[PDB]
Design a protein around this ligand. Structure first.
Ligand SMILES: Nc1ncnc2c1ncn2[C@@H]1O[C@H](CS)[C@@H](O)[C@H]1O
Ligand SMILES: Nc1ncnc2c1ncn2[C@@H]1O[C@H](CS)[C@@H](O)[C@H]1O
Lengths: 275, 287
């Protein structure tokens, strides 16, 4: 028997089997299932993913909230209700890993680069949990923020490599009024650090416009902006092609930056067109 | 959707083609059964097909793909038997409606990029000397499952460790498929059917009966306990001309981090010349 589903209400399920059965039932009724994976602590960045999901005709939106150990619940659920989301999937660690860590996903070599520098097993954790959520929910489309661009690219590789039948949708980064990419970590910044943190986005946008003068001009313009900020320890600043391989001589690319401000690590990235 | 002629064998090479046909069939109420093979089909494979065929409303998809990722150099990959004309003929005789015969390029267009990392069981038994073998197997089976999206997938008990690892894959990635283990098909003397049996000369073929003899002796000896069962198997293997034992192990049925209780599996691997043979059997202790 299919678990109870009340249309137009927020339906919260903690058992993987329960959301699996409801999702399957709903798709048969002519809904298109949209999945928005989160770790809770929702902000406007996450709501942008939800809104993208909602606008697909026939959509029913599943938002998962799960703090993946391998990589405010009441408030989160209120935000989802306010957005008209019909399904929240809130599993426990034990429900997701009933046999502990056993079979896992091993990413390709991109996972060792950039963010994989300090955190060499982070993306194995991410792709493992994402693969599981895809299999539990079986959505037609799954939504991720462009802010975590390397994550987004690795998920596209997961989907292609394992022949997954789901469309991956990248959603543009939501930003504060001065350009700073929205992140739960931003609140940890003291006033000086918060003022200095504007250099990430300013550096990237400066580079995007400098890029008419070529790749080197774009990189140099970004480095200059970061060089004008105090207490911003740049971990990397790299221009790559859109799949995060080596940047071609001309054409489309992505510029990525990460920096530490005190104990807080921030990331940002932007589309670049060379020439 | 490419053409599907029902009641005939339809052969598709493109993953997109079989995926489209499978989806179309499932949407009209047919239940899709998948039998993954590496070809060189014998009666053991046909038992899997027949098990699949008897699921009511079933449409049977047999994949044939000699998966490069589960082989290590040199050597073994080139040496694997390929008898595609016989394979397809056998599937026609069995009334299988779909054969999926993908190319290496279609399966691995990006080489080895994202892969499946099996649990600790993949390092043991068959995996000991071949530490990447089961990552190859689990990666291809995952892909086949995603392409075909069957209701049920059929594997032989002969490769018992592989069957266990596939159940792990299915559980650990929350795959919506039932895994069906099918009992080992044997020659009249007990020898487990294998595409590798073709490499036994008449003398080696005679000697090879020792594996199944040893296992069945142990299964009956087991009323007297584990030591008795193992020593009965060892005695038979020891009496066998030119059988070189790699391992003989009695484990819990899941082969995992749990001690043997009342139900186990006895597994053997042995070399007859250059041919490595496997077999296994259910064991009940004091029963
Ligand atoms: N400022 C932002 N804009 C867009 N998406 C964002 C974001 N901050 C986080 N996200 C997105 O939220 C998800 C959390 S698991 C992930 O897809 C991340 O990329
Ligand atoms: N003698 C036999 N009896 C039953 N199944 C067998 C078999 N020999 C091989 N198989 C089965 O055929 C498949 C080839 S990839 C695999 O599931 C193996 O376990």
């Amino acid at each position: 028997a299919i678990p109870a589903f009340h249309p137009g209400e927020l339906n919260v399920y903690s058992a993987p089997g329960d959301v699996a059965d409801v999702s399957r039932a709903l798709r048969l009724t002519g809904r298109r299932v949209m999945l928005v994976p989160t770790m809770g602590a929702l902000h406007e960045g996450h709501l942008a993913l939800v809104r993208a999901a909602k606008r697909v005709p026939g959509s029913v939106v599943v938002v998962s909230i799960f703090v993946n150990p391998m990589q405010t619940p009441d408030d989160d659920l209120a935000q989802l209700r306010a957005e008209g989301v019909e399904i929240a999937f809130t599993p426990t660690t034990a429900a997701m890993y009933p046999d502990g860590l056993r079979t896992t996903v091993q990413p390709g070599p991109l996972a060792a680069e950039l963010e994989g520098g300090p955190r060499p097993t982070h993306f194995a954790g991410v792709l493992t949990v994402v693969l599981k959520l895809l299999q539990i929910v079986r959505p037609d489309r799954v939504f991720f923020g462009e802010k975590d661009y390397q994550q987004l690219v690795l998920i596209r590789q997961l989907v292609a490599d394992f022949n997954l039948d789901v469309a991956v949708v990248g959603v543009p980064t939501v930003r504060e009024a001065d350009g700073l990419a929205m992140s739960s970590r931003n609140r940890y910044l003291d006033p000086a650090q918060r003022a200095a943190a504007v250099a990430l986005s300013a550096a990237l946008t400066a580079a995007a416009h400098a890029a008419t003068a070529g790749a080197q001009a774009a990189l140099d313009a970004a480095r200059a902006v970061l060089d004008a900020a105090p207490g911003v320890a740049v971990d990397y600043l790299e221009l790559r092609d859109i799949g995060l391989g080596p940047m071609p001589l001309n054409g489309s690319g992505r510029l990525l930056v990460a920096a530490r401000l005190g104990t807080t690590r921030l990331l940002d990235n932007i589309a670049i067109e060379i020439g």
